[PDB]
Write a protein that binds this DNA or RNA. Structure first.
Length: 48
RNA sequence: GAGAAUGUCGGGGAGCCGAGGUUGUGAAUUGCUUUCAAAAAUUUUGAAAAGCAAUUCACAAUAAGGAUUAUUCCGUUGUGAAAACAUUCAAGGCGGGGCAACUCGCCUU
């Protein structure tokens, strides 16, 4: 904080792909799976 | 000035449902008025009917009307003479979703 600023509103948050990240959280909580089942195809499907 | 992304404040349109109210029918109870209709001393009481009601319940309709049997609707909007429109609108295929009806995406004219 003490030396740099990022040219955007200092106290504002900006969207960072909520969809995939929240899918990742819900796919993490289920467990009992390999940590590779989340790919482009699976993510787009479950989104649909 | 234009364009895209992110938030804030408003507006418009469409849709799925709910509870009353009102008018009318039927009923339970109780009234005001009038006539029949008897008794009694112009007046008081009793039977019946009608008019108007009140409290509660069930039901019918809720813009007059016109479709249709899809678990679908059109009727208070705008334009304007055509009483004609607008407010829904193609073909396919490649998929996701369900008991399936049906719903949701992608691809080329």
């Amino acid at each position: 904080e003490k030396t740099h600023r990022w040219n955007f509103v200092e106290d504002k948050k900006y969207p960072c792909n909520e969809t995939k990240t929240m899918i990742s959280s819900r796919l993490d909580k289920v467990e009992n799976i390999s940590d590779d089942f989340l790919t482009r195809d699976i993510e787009q499907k479950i989104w649909h």
